[PDB]
Homo-oligomer: 480 residues x 4
Amino acid sequence: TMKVINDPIHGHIELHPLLVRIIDTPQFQRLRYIKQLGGGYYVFPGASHNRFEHSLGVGYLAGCLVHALGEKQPELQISERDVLCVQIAGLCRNLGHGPFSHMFDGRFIPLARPEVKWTHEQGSVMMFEHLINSNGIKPVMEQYGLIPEEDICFIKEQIVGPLELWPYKGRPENKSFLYEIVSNKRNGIDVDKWDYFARDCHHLGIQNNFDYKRFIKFARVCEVDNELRICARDKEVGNLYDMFHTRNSLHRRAYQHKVGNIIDTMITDAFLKADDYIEITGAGGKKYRISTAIDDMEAYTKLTDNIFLEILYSTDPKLKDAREILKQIEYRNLFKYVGETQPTGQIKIKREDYESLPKEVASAKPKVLLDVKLKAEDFIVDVINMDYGMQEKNPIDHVSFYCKTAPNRAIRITKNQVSQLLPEKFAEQLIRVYCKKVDRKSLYAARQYFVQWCADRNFTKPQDGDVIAPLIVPQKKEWN
Amino acid sequence: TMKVINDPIHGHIELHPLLVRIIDTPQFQRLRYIKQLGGGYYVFPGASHNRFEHSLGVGYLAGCLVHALGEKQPELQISERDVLCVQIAGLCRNLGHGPFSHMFDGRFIPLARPEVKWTHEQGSVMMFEHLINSNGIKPVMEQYGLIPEEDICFIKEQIVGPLELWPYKGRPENKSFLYEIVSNKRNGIDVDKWDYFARDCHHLGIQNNFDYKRFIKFARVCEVDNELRICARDKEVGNLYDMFHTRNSLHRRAYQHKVGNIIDTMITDAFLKADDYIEITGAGGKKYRISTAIDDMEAYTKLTDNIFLEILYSTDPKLKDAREILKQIEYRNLFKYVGETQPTGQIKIKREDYESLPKEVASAKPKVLLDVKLKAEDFIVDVINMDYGMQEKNPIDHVSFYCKTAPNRAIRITKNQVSQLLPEKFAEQLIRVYCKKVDRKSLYAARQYFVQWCADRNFTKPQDGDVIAPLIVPQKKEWN
Amino acid sequence: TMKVINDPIHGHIELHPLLVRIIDTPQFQRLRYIKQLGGGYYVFPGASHNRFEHSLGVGYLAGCLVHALGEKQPELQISERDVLCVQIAGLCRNLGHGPFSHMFDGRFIPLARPEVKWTHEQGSVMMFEHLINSNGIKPVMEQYGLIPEEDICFIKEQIVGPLELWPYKGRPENKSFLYEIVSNKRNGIDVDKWDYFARDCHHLGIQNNFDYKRFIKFARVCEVDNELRICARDKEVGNLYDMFHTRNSLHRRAYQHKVGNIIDTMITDAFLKADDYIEITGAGGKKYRISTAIDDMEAYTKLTDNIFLEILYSTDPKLKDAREILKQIEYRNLFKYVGETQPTGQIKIKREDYESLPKEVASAKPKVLLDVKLKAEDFIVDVINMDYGMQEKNPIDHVSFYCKTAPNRAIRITKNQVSQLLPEKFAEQLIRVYCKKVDRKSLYAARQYFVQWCADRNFTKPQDGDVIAPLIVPQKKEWN
Amino acid sequence: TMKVINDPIHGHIELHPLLVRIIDTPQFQRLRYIKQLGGGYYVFPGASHNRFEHSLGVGYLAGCLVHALGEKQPELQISERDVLCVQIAGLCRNLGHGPFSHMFDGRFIPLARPEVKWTHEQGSVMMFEHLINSNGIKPVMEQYGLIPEEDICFIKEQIVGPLELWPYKGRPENKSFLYEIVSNKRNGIDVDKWDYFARDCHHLGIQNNFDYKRFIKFARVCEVDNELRICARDKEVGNLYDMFHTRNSLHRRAYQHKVGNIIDTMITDAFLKADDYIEITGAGGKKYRISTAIDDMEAYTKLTDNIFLEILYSTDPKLKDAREILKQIEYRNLFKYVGETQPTGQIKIKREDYESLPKEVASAKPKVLLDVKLKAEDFIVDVINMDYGMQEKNPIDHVSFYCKTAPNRAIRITKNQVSQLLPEKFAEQLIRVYCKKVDRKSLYAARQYFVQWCADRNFTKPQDGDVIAPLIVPQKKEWN
Ligand SMILES: Nc1nc2c(ncn2[C@H]2C[C@H](O)[C@@H](COP(=O)(O)OP(=O)(O)OP(=O)(O)O)O2)c(=O)[nH]1
Ligand SMILES: Nc1nc2c(ncn2[C@H]2C[C@H](O)[C@@H](COP(=O)(O)OP(=O)(O)OP(=O)(O)O)O2)c(=O)[nH]1
Ligand SMILES: Nc1nc2c(ncn2[C@H]2C[C@H](O)[C@@H](COP(=O)(O)OP(=O)(O)OP(=O)(O)O)O2)c(=O)[nH]1
Ligand SMILES: Nc1nc2c(ncn2[C@H]2C[C@H](O)[C@@H](COP(=O)(O)OP(=O)(O)OP(=O)(O)O)O2)c(=O)[nH]1
Ligand SMILES: [Mg+2]
Ligand SMILES: [Mg+2]
Ligand SMILES: [Mg+2]
Ligand SMILES: [Mg+2]
């Protein structure tokens, strides 16, 4: 009442007792045991940080922004009840994360449970509900002036969007700007991003191109289309674009690091192999698989990065195959990266097609002499979609600006007004190919398959293609 | 033996005694009295740093890179003599800078001496010669194993390019890579840039996305077209593009800051007004103007940021007009910024046309009722060319890469291979308009003139145009 | 060739392949799963870093120092074989650490196994041997020019001192300075400290008073008493004292943080409760307790922070008591801190007396009316010894200096020469008292017991004593 | 409304328009032309920062603390008028500084004008009055709710203490805590210190021992002796001591750097030589010396670091001696540092003492064979007093603390309660000796004079004494 926590990114963070009550629960504390960057820690030893510290940061920044708007614009009638709700959403948006974070909902669940559609945000809402009910938080909310029925809705809406005009039941259109702060559905500019840019750079040893503190200073609320929305100062438009650039740097350099991804792939492989044999106790003593733990929050509370070690230390013969894979990670005996390429023209690769791609690479017949012949099962093909968070769309088209001369009047800024250099399209795809067989002979073969395949599909020439496949590259005139 | 200097960017820098001898001279120490960012200090109070500290940083980094290549590749046969020559060029490349740095050669000299063609690099070569001769350095160079005739040529060549087939007399083609380090004519990737990105961000409070230390680690020398050149690792290509992005961020945010530029303009105005009256004593007691001090290095040694204060504290009635302008800077009564716009389509603006542009803006007739009428003299129009340092050209097309699989074999990477998102053209122009009359009524008028002019010229719509000129904007269809 | 690892403290670290081979093993990778600061992470959310990253840092710095001495002093005849051996010791010095680091050897093992005398360094030597033998490293050592018999001895000796005139068989007296780098028995000034000062501050959000990079620049090897030792430049003496100040600041603020220590205590409690029931498989399928895992390295490889979760998620009724304690940690239902005090005059507290101390506090009869009566079992008393690493001794008396005027002649600098302000003794004791019963009534009682006990024992007055025990404090004249 | 300034230490600083009006004046802007660390810049190239940026930082922090207290304790009845007054005092505390900062009032004025007693704080008060009157600020103060008569008094009192039972007319005793923030007379803990610790380390490349942000969080106002005073939390006592430690590190390492001080001395020498010949115009066209410029604020406004260059570029024969000294600085031909020593026992050196000391060193007869004989005029002796800002006194004895258990009740914490290690006395004296004759023969002689003198006076043995005076050191038994 009220507690101070020291954060290496933000310094000294003040937390309201209600917030601290939420934090001090198994459901929140679970976050301590999940790595923010998953397998990236294996590539970047600095990235040891967990979801928990990030969540504090997100909660803190959400507080900063909402308070700043209140001081600048008292007419907005922001209340402490409003501030706490926004901060709670900030703290709890990452609650739903599974072991190794994005690996879990990004790779494992889709392969393990194709029938189901699941996301960590869906998990965060379920976990939040479980957190409140199991630990008697509603009385505490009431004690500090929150109205649980309205406010819990409001918190969940911030995390996951409308639960099903104005589509939100948590707050009226008058308070629309509040929905922008923690997870920005409209344009993706939100405090969650700011904390992780700063936190990940700090731990990775990389550097950030976006200043979040500056953005808060120049933020204003203006009426847009009978909605009150956060508006950025016109000057700051370049800085917004920088934010997205920074995001893409990080994703290319770290989140989508080629080796880091392969490790995530291998961990997923082990999980699939262990999935039937692992048993996690849920509410009522019911037993769940790693894949089905998402169905019961009590089970899910106990599901964390720890599973990795549980599998690794297991003596059970049923788990032997899963155990071997993790062991290969420890020895650094990884699947081998062959190459990266890009689709040409307007072509994009559909999700359905992903399964067929390894077969496609094996099918290519390079015009070369090969000692050994690879198989579709031997290859791994990873497709990565890089974008400004709106897929093809430009997020800044969806941002609102104001000018120094008339702060109250919102305006729109087109891409042409900022720069002619900026891209026509804001999304592109990367294709990475790996070979499961690591022998020198197998690797040489894989390169030939890969470069031929790139040529066959009219994909962009690999950068090292001249060196890895000198015989294959001359055949394609376009490559020269 | 070695002196150690502590640098906030680089930590502890070791300097060879020969280097220290060069540093401890009037000509080098002059750099202490010239602000790195000129008028930017008035916008950014952190940017108090001077050319001197930057030069040390450049010298140090040059040493780092050349040493690294020597340790990695002893076959290159790099010698200490080579190392010292590269470092001396690094230290002395900024020697030529005038008061307020780029303002002096960027703005003042062109207006004061249109007939002459001058650059600070020209000045650095002249100043270096003067430094060596006045302080008896050549014996010291010999004492440490340098051959002055060959080496002084080599140093000057690094600073300013060939002094007029291999075009350099300082070193043979086998040593070509050395010419890449301090000033890179071919692609602009050099240590001078790296130090200032780091140093300027540190002092400004901004942050950058280029890691120079990483670049050194991955640098290699490979044969390219019967030349030995520094080559980047293929992976690092994204980081190279990031370096240029970072450079553009800095330029937009700081080097070309709208208010900082206006102050530079005002300072230049004062210099022009004072130019006839100020006298600087040169060799033999000859007297020079601020504008002609570049002709005599002895005069130029004494020409620094100090001139600004000399004018400001002057009691001479002849200097009164110049003095007033500087006084207005102190009071913060500055010329007022009206707007920024961009040319469209094919159109580009030639240097010769610059004089014409203020008259053009006055000539526009808005079609809105105006209390007051402005004149060409009233306006200032500043044209800024933003590029990747190669004008229209893409610098990465002029970079050489190597691959992990064959470190010795250099390769070329096209833009398509890196990204589809990257720009088709790498240069653009910004037009900024300022009004000399600062009253509210004049400022309103200037905006109308400006927006109408943009419409007339088919320039891009100003971002705040709707707010500043609501009546003018509807007329242009293209702006809707 | 060399692998590069990016470290947020050190930037880009180059690792020799022999080093990488050692790193990529279960035994080394185990370090990924042990928190550097143990329970401190629960107090400091930034301190998520593990032993693994710290070990890389130690290895890197060891390399730096040895290389620097080689470059500065070729006459020392340092070899690559020497460099690799020093680096291997640096990397493997932390190999022996148990779950939660110092908690394990600091608290758990002494309570669980009073008969045995054990330290993590002893463990590191055993683990290193196990690592080499299990993974066939000796051939690899031979391949890179190491002599395993001589060099393995050398490595172990650096870690743990002489394995039992010159007492070391790993290297002769001419190479004595090498033994100073990784673990300094004489002074405690070593690279292991430097990395953790920088790494812990970075993660904790604290700041560091010692510059290790500067120290390396000014380090020299000189003959001292017929031994070659690393010597500091005379100027740097103040910085050395600062290093120790920094160490103390960290220890009081973070390593010995009152809440962090209590968490470590609780975790230890849980371990003791679980010890009989947990079974860890060792070599030959033998089964070990948490306490006995140190006897078998195969068992020990699998013993990590993971145990904490294993206990927490356990359904076994035998583990219920242990499980509850960890659950209380999650809810933040911790033992409560009562006060800190210091012994006065001659007095110091012997290790044997520690068992007695809780009873002593319960025995005190404060002159205040108490509704509830506490028992010896209710109290926890923690005795912490704070010193400059030499107990009562001043470490700088055991440092050798050289002067700019004669860099080869070692000299000695007394405390009086540096400062009159420096402490007469370099060691002191802190006593912290906690209450296991957390109710408000119990806590009030515990404070009265504690302050009375301080008065009885003639200990220093608690800082908050006037407020927590207003009735007790007037009785002691010395306090009033 | 608010202007935003970007500060590398503090990030984005909001400034009230009233504050901006004050800032945008010749009197404030003058601070841009005075180096914070004076001659230190010549030793540390990073330390290019000026008083101006520091002042903004002080103003900003003052605002932070006063706002924080208001939010935490509304009962205090702090008003915007109060906040602005405190900020104005923060901004203007450094207004009085002369060229090269402490050199000017520390060295030059005492030598030039021994009759007068002057400090920069006196200057700041005079300058502030001049700033307000010349630029018509009072109406602006009135416009924003200040009462000039009361508030100007309040501002001056904060800067310089009582202008002549409650001694202040600017605010009543209930508002006593406000006087603590900008300049703390009673204990020296104030925002001015916090900004410079952070700013100087950042520029220097050194690092901080004190967290100011944390201190603000834990600051509270409590009644002490019928006064309301800022009180620190009991826990933070160690950190307070650390703040003073940090201050001493900086002073020994940088502010009192031996070479930096000598440069300051040389600059002072030049000033004294130039003093009669330089003329600075004052109000009404009156002419002043450098030494008498402090008498007229109009003259003083134009007196800055620029003077150094004015002397250096002067052609006047009268200035030739002054000019030569500055030229010697450029060439790095400095007076040579001989040694440092300390007085022993109770002995202390009085200010009157200083003039005699060079003669005393010349008088010593080492009786070692000497080629040359030095004279009193040849030596320079610099006496430096290092303390916790209270001379002999412990500042923490003059701090007030509160406890978590009773936040409203202030308490006192004695040195014995924090640590037994802390010193009994908090002040010590350093004596540095320099020789004006730089030749090798002269330098050897000076060392002998110096070490003999240390022996004669029973001063502490110099650290390098054994090496510099091997014959002299054996004579003193106490040293051996
Ligand atoms: N930077 C810094 N952080 C600290 C220091 N001491 C503690 N911390 C960190 C640890 C926590 O994340 C945060 C708050 O810790 P505290 O020690 O102030 O809280 P604690 O609950 O132990 O004390 P309290 O309950 O108020 O008596 O600050 C310090 O001296 N410096
Ligand atoms: N600071 C920084 N670190 C990076 C970047 N990319 C990777 N790293 C880190 C991750 C690793 O700790 C270390 C080396 O990563 P690399 O991708 O350069 O090595 P990798 O083995 O993946 O590639 P290679 O075997 O050289 O093809 O540097 C980057 O752009 N910036
Ligand atoms: N978990 C935990 N860690 C501690 C404690 N005391 C110190 N540490 C941490 C601080 C450093 O990050 C690390 C240093 O341990 P090492 O075995 O590497 O060095 P050593 O034990 O010699 O510590 P020292 O040299 O005295 O700092 O241990 C403690 O009570 N608990
Ligand atoms: N970190 C950072 N600082 C900036 C940037 N642009 C400007 N600054 C600094 C320079 C100043 O100290 C401060 C404010 O400069 P601005 O350009 O934001 O204000 P200005 O008065 O020029 O614009 P205004 O009159 O409000 O339209 O922030 C930026 O993009 N990043
Ligand atoms: Mg020196
Ligand atoms: Mg690799
Ligand atoms: Mg402005
Ligand atoms: Mg002070």
